[PDB]
Symmetry: D2
Subunit: 121 residues, 4 copies
């Protein structure tokens, strides 16, 4: 179920995700990406489902980062959807969608999809 | 888009999205889905990139809804990633990922993908 | 759907899809994209699940196009996964993944996702 | 570039992918999944781009499997889109879409998305 979601997590690209999970299902924190048109920290907000089921399943959650801060504005946003699994080795396994603002003409290629796995290691 | 995004929006399935965009790039609201293991409203939170470009580009944004409220708990969460295009007929075009909590064995089938188009209602 | 799928189809972007469905569940044809780093026709191959169900369910199918022909090489490939719904107005609703070849460092940005709806033309 | 794509590959679920790559860009073979409403082998057909670029990049490719054979018909099809990287440890990194045939009513939940990594180990 929910619990040790709060913390500093890192993914395979070396990005850093620092989050706080509130008792009612809210997620707040900052994100720093190791790749892309990004630099320093960005604000993130999400939600996680605070009453996961009791057949050892993961806890579903998701969050968003709009890539604008006081250093850069990449006119895009990424949303990560996945589930947390705690235990000896806790992991957050996600799939994400990165949409950039385009003109109608380029709207067909506005969205990248990928997957990231986060650990506190 | 903060004034332009704020409002009531509906999508092709008949689901309702009520949102407020804050000066800081924040999006907060409630979502009511016309389909699925959902009932009543659910809280949503997201962000939108406040200073787009001039030009006729869309404003990127995204939000999340964990499908748990006082009436139902579906143990899943959906994230919508898309762009807002304003105008007389403003629209928000998105693609979404719906992940259900699963055992490690069934994790390969935990995520659904789709796309929704939202139309804003007057006011 | 083998007779129903066989034909010329166009999607919202103005791209052409000419296909033949074989008794064995095979799909073979050519694709012409209205957008992207593409020119002329490209070969496509796919499969479709020949014995659907009775009922008013769609026929699942999917196909791939590697964007290389005698005129252009974009070093990318797109796969479309969707369902065929026949009737007077038959449609093929799909979601696709377009992967470009990259270095390991840029692999995180190698795949685009989208959705296309195709309309069959008479004959 | 292209080359040792032909062979028997296995993914993290233990599924087996046996493919033959033709000199003009065709891929043919069989697929056996370790999970899902599937059993025994299924026919697969795909394409790979036979002239990848010369900045050590992967070779883009994709293939499809309709899940019907003489044992089962799951009324679905999966398409894998990704790139091959050869070398000491060759890998095929993909993202896939699994669409099941549904009624219009259930069309919103007809497609699963996931990612698989294949090795010859
Ligand atoms: O380039 C941009 O548009 C802004 C930075 C995007 C970074 C992406 S989001 C998904 C992937 N996971 C990460 O940790 N960073 C990249
Ligand atoms: O069934 C669930 O797990 C919760 C309800 C999911 C409803 C989905 S979210 C994406 C799509 N868009 C909608 O408006 N409703 C469905
Ligand atoms: O630019 C490329 O790499 C090759 C052309 C890609 C065209 C894409 S495939 C999905 C979408 N549907 C179309 O008909 N065209 C675009
Ligand atoms: O259950 C079905 O509809 C048929 C079997 C699906 C097996 C899937 S395809 C993606 C993932 N990768 C595998 O090797 N098998 C599963
Ligand atoms: Cl606010
Ligand atoms: Cl044939």
């Amino acid at each position: 179920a929910e619990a040790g979601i709060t913390g500093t997590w890192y993914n395979q690209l070396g990005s850093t995700f620092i989050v706080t999970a509130g008792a009612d299902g809210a997620l707040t924190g900052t994100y720093e990406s190791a790749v892309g048109n990004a630099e320093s920290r960005y604000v993130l907000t999400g939600r996680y489902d605070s009453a996961p089921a009791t057949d050892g399943s993961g806890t579903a959650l998701g969050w968003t980062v709009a890539w604008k801060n006081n250093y850069r504005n990449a006119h895009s946003a990424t949303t990560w959807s996945g589930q947390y699994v705690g235990g000896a080795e806790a992991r957050i396994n996600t799939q994400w969608l990165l949409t950039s603002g385009t003109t109608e003409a380029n709207a067909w290629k506005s969205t990248l999809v990928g997957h990231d796995t986060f650990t506190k290691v």
